[PDB]
Amino acid sequence: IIQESQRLQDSIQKEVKHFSAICLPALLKVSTDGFNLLPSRELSINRMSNT
Amino acid sequence: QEQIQTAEREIVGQDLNCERAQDLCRRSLLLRAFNKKREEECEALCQSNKK
Amino acid sequence: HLLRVTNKKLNHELQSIVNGVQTLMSFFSTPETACELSSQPIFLSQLLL
């Protein structure tokens, strides 16, 4: 119980710190050929035009 | 035509500030959902501690 | 700030479970290894027949 309690110590503050560094648009997946989900940021239209 | 091109550059600069305000709103919604889910887990641990 | 309060509550409940279980286990320890405290036997298995 001491070992598993130490793993969970500051769990919320660890996840929030990692989440703060993420780019939300990189999570947004789109399917071109029905099977392959690519991040919308990897689409050439978005690489070239997205601010 | 120089005056027009200067004011066009100022309009494009404003569209960039609106997207930052929206990213903050999305992050704040996700972190509210996360806080609610962590309150439910904390309430479960509080019941285990009472036992 | 809400998440920082929830983190302190979660850490407090985690520490209370640790302290609660250590206190719970102190009732099961045999009197030979515990110092001079009046460890009056609680269980039938701790009594000398």
Could you tell me the two tokens for C22? Answer: 């250590």
Chains sharing 3 or more CB pairs under 8 A with chain A: B, C
Cα separation values, C42 from A2, C28, C46, C47, C49, Å: 26, 8, 7, 8, 14
- Residue C3 one-letter amino acid: L
Which residues have C-beta within 8 Å of that of residue B47, sequence separation ≥ 6? none
Rounded Cα–Cα distance for residues B11 and A32 (Å): 33
Rounded Cα–Cα distance for residues A8 and C11 (Å): 8
Closest by CA position to C14, among listed A4, B39, A15: A4
Rounded Cα–Cα distance for residues B51 and A43 (Å): 54
Resolution of the model in angstroms: 6.9
| C interface test, pick of A2, A7, A12 with most C CB neighbours within 10 Å | A12
First-to-last C-alpha distance (Å) of chain C: 59
Element (H, E) at B10: helix B2-50
Q: Could you tell me which residues of chain B have a Cβ less than 8 Å from any Cβ in chain A? A: 15-16, 19, 23, 26-27, 30-31, 34, 38
Pairing of strands A29-31, A37-39: antiparallel
B25: helix, coil or strand?
A: helix
